[PDB]
């Protein structure tokens, strides 16, 4: 049913964006995560001036976006607890020419300004999920280590295409490459020997 994968800190997905560039006036990223670790990179897309970086940082959800002329950084956290509580949490990030929106469970922020510029929402370089090469620190990544925990239904969507990255990794795609080996289920995180 749902496309899930468990990352153990040495594994990541990489969807080849070189031979198929992506451009749009708006885009959207959705995923659910479950984890016990305080820090870890969940998703990065973009090696250009444009990028989106989504990570856990000290048990908070961290989002860093470079949307053309401007930059956005947010940190989100429950008040009496953290997001590395071994429970699923749902993330949705929406960008367009005038506005960025992020929601994590019961909190939503929408922020924008009049840009008055011609810009392109795209990325040439690989779309990374769950981690990234160790000798490759990605633009705007606040954390330096790969994810440990579960990611589910990672989907990137724009006005041209919709990529079910979690599904593609589970099934297979010549542009979808997996570093290491990951189980396409959510393992009991309390026991990650």
């Amino acid at each position: 049913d749902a496309s899930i994968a468990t990352f153990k800190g040495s594994e990541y997905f990489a969807y080849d964006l070189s031979q198929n560039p992506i451009q749009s006036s708006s885009d959207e990223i959705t995923l659910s995560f479950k984890t016990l670790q305080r820090n870890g990179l969940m998703l990065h897309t973009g090696k250009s001036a444009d990028y989106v970086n989504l990570a856990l940082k000290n048990g908070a959800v961290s989002l860093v976006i470079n949307l053309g002329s401007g930059a956005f950084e947010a940190l989100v956290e429950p008040v009496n607890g953290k997001f590395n509580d071994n429970a699923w949490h749902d993330v949705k990030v929406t960008r367009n020419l005038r506005q960025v929106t992020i929601s994590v469970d019961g909190i939503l922020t929408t922020t924008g300004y009049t840009q008055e510029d011609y810009t392109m929402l795209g990325s040439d370089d690989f779309f990374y999920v769950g981690g990234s090469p160790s000798t490759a620190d990605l633009p705007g990544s606040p954390v330096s280590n790969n994810f440990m925990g579960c990611l589910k239904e990672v989907v990137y969507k724009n006005n041209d295409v919709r990529l079910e990255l979690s599904r593609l990794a589970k099934q297979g795609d010549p542009k979808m490459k997996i570093h290491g080996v990951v189980a396409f289920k959510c393992a009991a995180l309390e026991v990650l020997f």
Binding site: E73, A74, L75, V76, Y113
Partner: protein
């Protein structure tokens, strides 16, 4: 001129709703003002300010750069009613005027939001990519 205007932000939980608007005004004398208005309803603390791009995004219990606050007006109404006994609702309207000396124009907007269910900090730098 400037790379942006008519800044807006909305942060929403079921416990606190925050609406922010921001406006720039170039006075033509080497200074410009940034005006923030914000309205919040519910429970929790909210703040909006100007910061340099080097400001670290982090949570904080407390409350070179050529911008300073010249005027601030805050109106806060508190309604106390017990839920099941306690319990309260806060309505807040703030206006803040920042005055900036123009030689430096790379300013960021920093918003904090501490409710009873969620907390969020965010930094928006609208023309940062004119910095480098």
């Amino acid at each position: 001129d400037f790379g942006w205007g008519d800044f807006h932000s909305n942060i929403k939980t079921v416990k606190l709703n925050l609406l922010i608007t921001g406006k720039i005004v170039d006075h033509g004398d080497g200074t410009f003002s940034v005006y923030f208005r914000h309205d919040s309803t519910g429970q929790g603390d909210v703040s909006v300010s100007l910061v340099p791009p080097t400001k670290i995004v982090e949570f904080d219990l407390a409350q070179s750069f050529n911008c300073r606050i010249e005027y601030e007006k805050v109106d806060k109404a508190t309604k106390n009613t017990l839920c099941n006994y306690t319990c309260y609702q806060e309505q807040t309207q703030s206006h803040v005027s920042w005055l900036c000396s123009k030689p430096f124009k790379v300013i960021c907007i920093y918003i904090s939001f501490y409710s009873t269910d969620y907390k969020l900090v965010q930094k928006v730098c609208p023309d940062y990519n004119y910095h480098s």
